[PDB]
Amino acid sequence: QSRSLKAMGEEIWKNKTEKINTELFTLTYGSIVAQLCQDYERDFNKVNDHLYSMGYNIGCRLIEDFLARTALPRCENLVKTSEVLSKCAFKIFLNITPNITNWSHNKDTFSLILDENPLADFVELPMDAMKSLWYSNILCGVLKGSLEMVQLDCDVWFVSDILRGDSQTEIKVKLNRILKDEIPIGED
Template identity: 60%
Template sequence: MSKKSGDDIWKGSVEKINSELFTLTYGSLVSQLCRDFQNNYQEVNIQLDKMGYNIGLRLIEEFLAKTGIRRCSSFKETADIISKLGFKLFLNFQPTVENWSNDNKICSLIIPEPNPLTEFVDLPPTAKDLWYSQILCGVLRGALQMVQLDCDVYFVKDVLKGDDKTEMKLKLNKILKDEVPV
């Protein structure tokens, strides 16, 4: 799979920040977006996704440099590496990959509890349209695009909304061709 495991990289010389500081800072960001968009939660979701997408475009370079990983041969292998290395490296948890479609183009990432982004969060009943951790969808979408995978990434369940688990769907739309500049 890779030269190092997610645990090895995490224990190594990776710069770390306090998880509570990260959680509270992210919470402040979401709160500010809710105020800026006057609790239009669909617009807040769009903004979080855009932010995440831009983070993902840049984060993939750091991920590839720190892991020394080779190019994946399939979407299934990519999802496995995202789960075992990507989340571990940057957020210190490992979602499980489940519910593969017959054609191996759709899967679920089940985020373990407690989700570090939602550790101190209670959503008000009026925020039923808010996907609080939507930034993760954007990060994955941006990172996957940089490795030539056009994917849809979206939440289908969230413990904050009363669901039994937090579940994201990854759907491979197409493999992008390597573009050679003119």
């Protein structure tokens, strides 16, 4: 238990990793969340796809840094993954520790309750998007790209965002398949 999962996650945030002001990132995200609403003339849904699309490209880059530091092996169950992601990923990147619940028979999917969202839990949604936007979609999209870069082919999506007056915040992360990787040179 040299590096319990929670403990590694915390040791990582504290003793070593580079940081920036939380507020600085918050506003930069706000420009992108807000910038898109103007650009997509109030079509909240167009934006979410946009953020989620943004989350994937960054997610692919980041999965690379995350592995570089924690040095974890490619977990084969969704569950080890659920655990690695919540104590390790969040703590290291957003000094946060989301939960893991609403698990379904087969370990199909597992939500990912974020009770404190450093990202944006201070916002007060305009009576517009209040019904369509998932402010933190880029966050969700980063997960999809990250899992995919380590073969887990999953489906990350919202069902609850405090922001939309929901009772909580819950990102579901379903597993679809595990991808293979090979090299044909000979008789193909």
